[PDB]
Amino acid sequence: RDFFNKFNLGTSNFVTPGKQLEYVSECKPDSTAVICLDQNCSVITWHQLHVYSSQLAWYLIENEIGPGSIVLTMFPNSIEHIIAVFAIWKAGACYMPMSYKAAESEIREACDTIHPNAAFAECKIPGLKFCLSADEIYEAMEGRSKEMPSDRLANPNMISLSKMKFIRQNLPCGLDDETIRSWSLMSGMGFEQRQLLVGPLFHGAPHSAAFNGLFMGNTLVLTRNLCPGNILNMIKKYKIEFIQMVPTLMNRLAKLEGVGKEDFASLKALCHTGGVCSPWLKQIWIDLLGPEKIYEMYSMTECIGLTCIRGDEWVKHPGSIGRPVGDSKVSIRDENGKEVAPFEIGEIYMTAPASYLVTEYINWEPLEVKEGGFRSVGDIGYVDEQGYLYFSD
């Protein structure tokens, strides 16, 4: 069939990340998949990425890491981290990332709460099935089949950390046409755009951006030095076309001496999420790149909902965080649970996209859900006549 997912050489709509990696590497085996700046630069082709992650999955499989297993991953932003994730998922296991700078008490708390079965880490954690350093993953690979293990689902695919709270994604990793299209409409990401990653891979947003980027055949550029002047140089030098960032980074980049439209001209889309972006900072970026290039996603508290808004809509609805994505709905309600008129202030109830409905805060009791699938955390705001949502405080 002829899929919106242009690499899908197969028969089903839904494709796992490993199968998608296979398809992409068949189409362009020797193009660069990941570029890593460490000054020191390393690269890996789609074909190597595919082959090494398959070899590493066979090692997981021999060690009985699979569905039901949880693999803690504490590599920094590196090729090896990327390989590890694909290998974990190719084996059906659940990926659990944390900072490579996590403190000992946090590692201890995470192990004592989740009880992971293995790990990728530079410092050896006792009592696990294995604990491989970044150098050791190549040794674990040596000798193993270059063919991917037979395709399989990894559910849950991830547990992530935000004293500590753990969020578990009870759905298999991968995407279908509808979810790719929808990701592309909310983020501005298209097919075959060089992406620069400037968030840590253990955060949820940068995780999505990197692996949805690789899923779409985009080359991923990773950097360890997140100094703004450096980031800007990397944008130019690699002709970056897509970048996701937090508002803090947008604020610093806009303040660099000299900067202007021309420095960012390679960009097709800038996506921002994961912190308040003031109207001032938004206007500055709309003026730097053009309003159709600024994409924003606002994920509500506790996953009750997700909105998005593009810069040209934001100029027409200034202050808004967008409209609920896809088939999601928002309902602004008064103190008796009744929906109100446009511009009236009340509690924000929302329905959630598919993926959020099967996302769980571990050891936290879920929210009350009203009829239609509506939840609230008590946020206060309003909608305008076109359904754009605004916060009051």
Coordinates of C-alpha atoms in Angstrom, one line a residue:
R1 CA 0.0 0.0 0.0
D2 CA 1.0 3.6 -0.5
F3 CA 1.4 5.2 2.9
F4 CA 1.8 8.7 4.2
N5 CA 4.9 7.1 5.8
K6 CA 7.0 7.2 2.7
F7 CA 9.5 4.6 3.9
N8 CA 6.9 2.0 4.7
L9 CA 7.8 -0.9 2.4
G10 CA 5.5 -3.3 4.1
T11 CA 2.0 -4.3 4.6
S12 CA 0.8 -2.7 7.8
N13 CA 0.0 0.8 8.8
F14 CA 1.7 0.6 12.2
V15 CA 5.4 0.2 12.1
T16 CA 7.8 -0.3 15.0
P17 CA 10.9 1.7 15.3
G18 CA 13.2 -1.2 14.4
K19 CA 11.2 -2.1 11.3
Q20 CA 11.2 1.5 10.3
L21 CA 14.9 1.7 10.8
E22 CA 15.2 -1.3 8.5
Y23 CA 13.1 0.3 5.8
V24 CA 15.0 3.6 6.0
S25 CA 18.4 1.9 5.8
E26 CA 17.2 -0.1 2.8
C27 CA 16.4 3.1 1.0
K28 CA 19.7 4.9 1.9
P29 CA 22.2 2.6 3.6
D30 CA 25.2 4.8 3.4
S31 CA 23.8 8.2 4.2
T32 CA 24.6 9.6 7.6
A33 CA 22.0 8.9 10.3
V34 CA 23.5 10.4 13.3
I35 CA 26.3 13.0 13.7
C36 CA 27.8 13.4 17.2
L37 CA 30.0 16.3 18.5
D38 CA 31.7 15.1 21.7
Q39 CA 35.0 19.4 19.2
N40 CA 35.4 15.6 18.6
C41 CA 33.0 14.3 15.8
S42 CA 31.6 10.8 15.2
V43 CA 29.1 9.6 12.6
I44 CA 27.0 6.5 11.8
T45 CA 25.2 5.5 8.6
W46 CA 21.6 4.2 8.5
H47 CA 23.0 0.8 7.7
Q48 CA 25.4 0.7 10.7
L49 CA 22.7 2.0 13.0
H50 CA 20.4 -0.7 11.9
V51 CA 23.1 -3.5 12.0
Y52 CA 24.6 -2.5 15.4
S53 CA 21.2 -2.1 17.1
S54 CA 20.2 -5.6 15.8
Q55 CA 23.5 -7.1 17.1
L56 CA 23.0 -5.5 20.4
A57 CA 19.3 -6.8 20.6
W58 CA 20.6 -10.4 20.1
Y59 CA 22.8 -9.8 23.1
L60 CA 19.7 -8.6 25.1
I61 CA 17.8 -11.7 23.9
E62 CA 20.5 -14.1 24.9
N63 CA 20.5 -12.5 28.4
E64 CA 16.7 -12.9 28.6
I65 CA 16.0 -9.2 28.3
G66 CA 12.6 -8.9 26.6
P67 CA 8.9 -8.1 27.2
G68 CA 8.6 -7.5 31.0
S69 CA 12.2 -6.4 31.3
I70 CA 13.3 -2.8 32.1
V71 CA 16.6 -1.5 31.0
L72 CA 18.0 1.6 32.7
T73 CA 20.0 3.8 30.3
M74 CA 22.4 6.5 31.6
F75 CA 24.5 7.3 28.5
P76 CA 24.8 11.0 27.6
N77 CA 23.6 12.2 24.2
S78 CA 25.7 9.9 22.0
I79 CA 25.5 7.5 19.1
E80 CA 25.7 4.7 21.7
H81 CA 22.7 5.9 23.5
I82 CA 20.8 5.9 20.2
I83 CA 21.9 2.4 19.4
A84 CA 20.9 1.2 22.9
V85 CA 17.4 2.4 22.5
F86 CA 16.8 0.8 19.2
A87 CA 18.2 -2.5 20.7
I88 CA 16.0 -2.4 23.7
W89 CA 13.0 -1.9 21.6
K90 CA 14.0 -4.6 19.1
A91 CA 14.1 -7.0 21.9
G92 CA 10.6 -6.0 23.2
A93 CA 12.0 -4.5 26.4
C94 CA 11.2 -1.1 28.1
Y95 CA 13.7 1.7 27.9
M96 CA 14.3 3.7 31.1
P97 CA 16.5 6.7 30.6
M98 CA 18.1 8.9 33.3
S99 CA 20.8 11.6 33.4
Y100 CA 24.4 10.4 33.1
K101 CA 24.9 12.8 36.0
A102 CA 22.1 11.3 38.2
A103 CA 23.3 11.2 41.8
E104 CA 23.8 7.9 43.6
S105 CA 20.7 8.4 45.8
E106 CA 18.6 8.9 42.6
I107 CA 19.9 5.8 41.0
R108 CA 19.1 4.0 44.2
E109 CA 15.6 5.4 44.4
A110 CA 15.0 4.5 40.8
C111 CA 16.2 0.9 41.2
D112 CA 14.3 0.5 44.5
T113 CA 11.0 1.8 42.8
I114 CA 11.2 0.3 39.3
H115 CA 13.6 -2.7 39.9
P116 CA 15.3 -2.6 36.5
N117 CA 16.8 -5.8 35.1
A118 CA 19.8 -4.4 33.2
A119 CA 21.6 -1.3 32.3
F120 CA 23.7 0.8 30.1
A121 CA 25.9 3.0 32.3
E122 CA 29.5 4.0 32.6
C123 CA 29.6 3.3 36.4
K124 CA 28.7 -0.4 37.2
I125 CA 25.5 -0.9 39.1
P126 CA 25.5 -4.2 41.1
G127 CA 22.8 -6.8 41.1
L128 CA 21.6 -6.6 37.5
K129 CA 21.7 -9.0 34.6
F130 CA 24.4 -6.8 32.9
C131 CA 25.6 -3.3 33.1
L132 CA 27.4 -2.3 29.9
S133 CA 29.6 0.8 29.4
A134 CA 29.5 2.6 26.0
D135 CA 32.8 0.8 25.0
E136 CA 31.4 -2.5 26.2
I137 CA 28.4 -2.4 23.9
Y138 CA 30.7 -3.0 20.8
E139 CA 32.2 -6.1 22.5
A140 CA 28.6 -7.4 23.3
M141 CA 27.9 -7.0 19.6
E142 CA 30.8 -8.9 18.3
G143 CA 30.0 -12.1 16.5
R144 CA 26.1 -11.7 16.5
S145 CA 23.7 -11.8 13.6
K146 CA 23.5 -8.6 11.6
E147 CA 19.8 -9.5 10.8
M148 CA 17.2 -7.8 13.1
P149 CA 15.4 -10.2 15.4
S150 CA 11.9 -11.0 14.1
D151 CA 9.8 -7.8 14.4
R152 CA 8.0 -7.4 17.8
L153 CA 6.3 -4.9 20.0
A154 CA 7.7 -3.2 23.0
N155 CA 5.0 -2.4 25.5
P156 CA 5.6 -0.6 27.7
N157 CA 8.1 1.1 25.6
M158 CA 9.4 3.7 28.1
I159 CA 9.5 4.8 31.7
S160 CA 10.7 8.3 32.2
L161 CA 11.5 10.4 35.3
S162 CA 10.2 13.8 36.2
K163 CA 10.9 13.3 45.4
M164 CA 11.0 11.4 42.0
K165 CA 8.0 10.7 39.7
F166 CA 8.0 8.0 37.0
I167 CA 5.9 8.0 34.0
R168 CA 5.2 4.8 32.1
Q169 CA 4.1 4.7 28.5
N170 CA 1.8 1.6 28.2
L171 CA 1.9 1.5 24.5
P172 CA 4.2 0.0 21.9
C173 CA 6.7 2.3 20.4
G174 CA 6.3 3.0 16.7
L175 CA 3.9 5.0 14.5
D176 CA 1.2 4.7 12.0
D177 CA 0.2 7.2 9.2
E178 CA -2.3 9.1 11.4
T179 CA 0.2 9.6 14.2
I180 CA 3.0 10.7 11.8
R181 CA 0.8 13.1 10.1
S182 CA -0.4 14.5 13.3
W183 CA 3.2 14.8 14.7
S184 CA 4.1 16.6 11.6
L185 CA 1.2 19.0 11.9
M186 CA 2.0 19.9 15.5
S187 CA 5.8 20.1 15.4
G188 CA 6.5 21.3 11.9
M189 CA 8.7 18.3 11.3
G190 CA 8.8 17.0 7.7
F191 CA 10.6 14.2 6.0
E192 CA 14.4 14.5 5.5
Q193 CA 15.3 17.6 7.3
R194 CA 18.5 17.7 9.3
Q195 CA 17.6 18.0 13.0
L196 CA 19.8 19.4 15.8
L197 CA 19.1 18.0 19.2
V198 CA 19.6 20.4 22.1
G199 CA 17.7 18.7 24.9
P200 CA 18.9 15.7 27.0
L201 CA 17.6 12.4 25.6
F202 CA 16.2 11.3 29.0
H203 CA 13.6 14.1 28.8
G204 CA 10.3 13.2 27.1
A205 CA 10.2 16.0 24.5
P206 CA 13.7 15.6 23.1
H207 CA 13.2 11.8 23.3
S208 CA 10.1 12.2 20.9
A209 CA 11.8 14.7 18.7
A210 CA 14.9 12.5 18.2
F211 CA 13.2 9.2 17.6
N212 CA 10.3 10.6 15.7
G213 CA 13.0 12.4 13.6
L214 CA 14.9 9.2 13.0
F215 CA 11.6 7.4 12.2
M216 CA 11.0 10.1 9.5
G217 CA 14.5 9.5 8.0
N218 CA 15.9 12.7 9.3
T219 CA 19.5 12.9 10.1
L220 CA 20.1 13.7 13.8
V221 CA 22.9 16.0 14.9
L222 CA 23.8 15.5 18.6
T223 CA 25.9 17.9 20.7
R224 CA 27.3 17.8 24.2
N225 CA 28.1 21.6 24.3
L226 CA 24.8 23.5 24.7
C227 CA 26.4 27.0 24.8
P228 CA 24.1 29.3 22.7
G229 CA 26.8 30.8 20.5
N230 CA 27.9 27.2 19.8
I231 CA 24.4 26.1 19.0
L232 CA 24.0 28.9 16.5
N233 CA 27.3 28.0 14.8
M234 CA 26.0 24.3 14.5
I235 CA 22.7 25.6 13.0
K236 CA 24.7 27.2 10.2
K237 CA 27.5 24.8 9.7
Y238 CA 25.2 21.7 9.4
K239 CA 22.3 23.7 7.7
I240 CA 19.9 22.6 10.3
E241 CA 16.3 22.5 9.1
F242 CA 14.4 21.4 12.2
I243 CA 15.1 22.2 15.8
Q244 CA 13.1 21.8 19.0
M245 CA 13.9 23.9 22.0
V246 CA 12.7 25.2 25.3
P247 CA 12.0 29.0 25.7
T248 CA 15.1 29.5 27.8
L249 CA 17.2 28.6 24.8
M250 CA 15.0 30.8 22.5
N251 CA 15.6 33.7 24.9
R252 CA 19.4 33.3 24.9
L253 CA 19.7 32.8 21.2
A254 CA 17.7 36.0 20.5
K255 CA 20.1 38.0 22.7
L256 CA 23.4 37.0 21.0
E257 CA 25.2 40.0 19.7
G258 CA 24.9 40.4 15.9
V259 CA 22.2 37.8 15.4
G260 CA 19.4 38.3 12.8
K261 CA 17.0 36.6 10.2
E262 CA 20.0 35.5 8.1
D263 CA 21.6 33.4 10.9
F264 CA 18.5 31.2 11.0
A265 CA 17.6 31.1 7.3
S266 CA 18.3 27.3 7.0
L267 CA 15.4 26.5 9.4
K268 CA 12.2 25.2 8.0
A269 CA 10.7 24.9 11.5
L270 CA 11.4 25.7 15.1
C271 CA 9.3 23.8 17.5
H272 CA 9.0 24.8 21.2
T273 CA 7.5 23.1 24.1
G274 CA 8.1 22.6 27.8
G275 CA 8.2 25.9 29.4
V276 CA 6.3 29.2 29.4
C277 CA 7.0 31.3 26.3
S278 CA 6.0 35.0 26.9
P279 CA 4.3 37.0 24.1
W280 CA 7.4 39.1 23.9
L281 CA 9.7 36.1 23.2
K282 CA 7.1 34.7 20.7
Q283 CA 6.9 37.9 18.7
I284 CA 10.7 38.1 18.6
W285 CA 10.9 34.6 17.0
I286 CA 8.0 35.2 14.6
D287 CA 9.9 38.2 13.4
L288 CA 13.2 36.2 13.1
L289 CA 11.9 33.2 11.2
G290 CA 8.5 34.1 9.9
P291 CA 5.2 33.2 11.6
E292 CA 4.6 29.9 9.6
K293 CA 7.9 28.5 11.0
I294 CA 7.2 28.8 14.7
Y295 CA 5.4 25.6 16.0
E296 CA 4.4 25.3 19.6
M297 CA 3.0 22.3 21.5
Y298 CA 1.7 22.6 25.0
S299 CA 1.3 19.4 27.0
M300 CA -1.1 20.0 29.9
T301 CA -0.3 18.8 33.4
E302 CA -0.6 15.1 34.2
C303 CA -1.3 14.4 30.4
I304 CA -4.9 15.4 30.5
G305 CA -4.5 17.1 27.1
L306 CA -2.3 18.6 24.4
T307 CA -2.7 21.7 22.3
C308 CA -0.7 23.2 19.5
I309 CA -0.5 26.5 17.7
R310 CA 1.5 27.8 14.8
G311 CA 2.9 31.4 14.7
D312 CA 0.4 32.6 12.1
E313 CA -2.5 31.4 14.2
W314 CA -0.9 33.0 17.2
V315 CA -0.7 36.4 15.6
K316 CA -4.6 36.0 15.1
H317 CA -5.1 34.7 18.7
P318 CA -2.4 36.3 20.7
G319 CA -1.7 34.7 24.1
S320 CA -3.4 31.4 23.1
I321 CA -1.7 28.0 23.5
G322 CA -3.6 26.7 20.6
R323 CA -6.5 24.3 20.0
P324 CA -6.6 20.8 21.2
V325 CA -4.8 18.4 18.8
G326 CA -6.6 16.0 16.5
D327 CA -10.0 15.0 17.8
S328 CA -9.3 16.2 21.4
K329 CA -11.7 18.7 23.0
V330 CA -11.6 21.3 25.6
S331 CA -14.5 22.4 27.7
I332 CA -14.4 25.4 30.0
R333 CA -16.7 24.8 32.9
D334 CA -18.4 26.8 35.7
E335 CA -18.6 25.8 39.3
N336 CA -21.6 23.5 38.7
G337 CA -19.9 21.5 35.9
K338 CA -21.8 23.3 33.1
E339 CA -20.0 24.4 29.9
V340 CA -19.7 28.2 29.5
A341 CA -19.8 30.7 26.6
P342 CA -16.8 31.9 24.7
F343 CA -14.6 34.3 26.8
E344 CA -16.2 33.3 30.1
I345 CA -13.6 32.1 32.6
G346 CA -13.9 28.6 34.2
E347 CA -12.1 25.3 34.8
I348 CA -10.3 23.7 31.9
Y349 CA -11.4 20.2 31.1
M350 CA -9.9 18.3 28.2
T351 CA -10.0 15.0 26.5
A352 CA -6.6 13.4 25.7
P353 CA -5.0 11.9 22.5
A354 CA -4.7 8.2 22.4
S355 CA -1.1 8.0 23.6
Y356 CA -1.8 10.0 26.8
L357 CA -4.8 7.8 27.8
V358 CA -2.3 4.9 28.3
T359 CA 0.3 6.9 30.1
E360 CA 0.5 6.3 33.9
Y361 CA 2.2 8.1 36.7
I362 CA 3.5 5.1 38.7
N363 CA 2.2 4.9 42.3
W364 CA -0.1 7.9 41.7
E365 CA -3.8 7.6 41.7
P366 CA -5.5 8.7 38.5
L367 CA -7.7 11.7 38.0
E368 CA -11.4 11.6 38.0
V369 CA -12.7 11.3 34.5
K370 CA -16.2 12.8 33.6
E371 CA -18.5 11.7 30.8
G372 CA -16.9 12.0 27.4
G373 CA -13.4 11.4 28.8
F374 CA -12.9 14.8 30.3
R375 CA -10.4 15.6 33.1
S376 CA -9.2 18.8 34.8
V377 CA -6.3 19.7 37.1
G378 CA -8.1 22.9 38.1
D379 CA -6.4 25.2 35.5
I380 CA -8.4 28.4 34.9
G381 CA -9.0 29.9 31.5
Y382 CA -11.2 30.4 28.5
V383 CA -11.7 29.8 24.8
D384 CA -12.4 32.3 22.0
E385 CA -15.1 32.0 19.4
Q386 CA -12.8 29.8 17.2
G387 CA -12.0 27.5 20.1
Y388 CA -8.5 28.7 20.9
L389 CA -7.6 28.2 24.5
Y390 CA -6.1 30.8 26.9
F391 CA -4.9 30.7 30.5
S392 CA -6.1 33.3 33.0
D393 CA -3.3 33.5 35.7

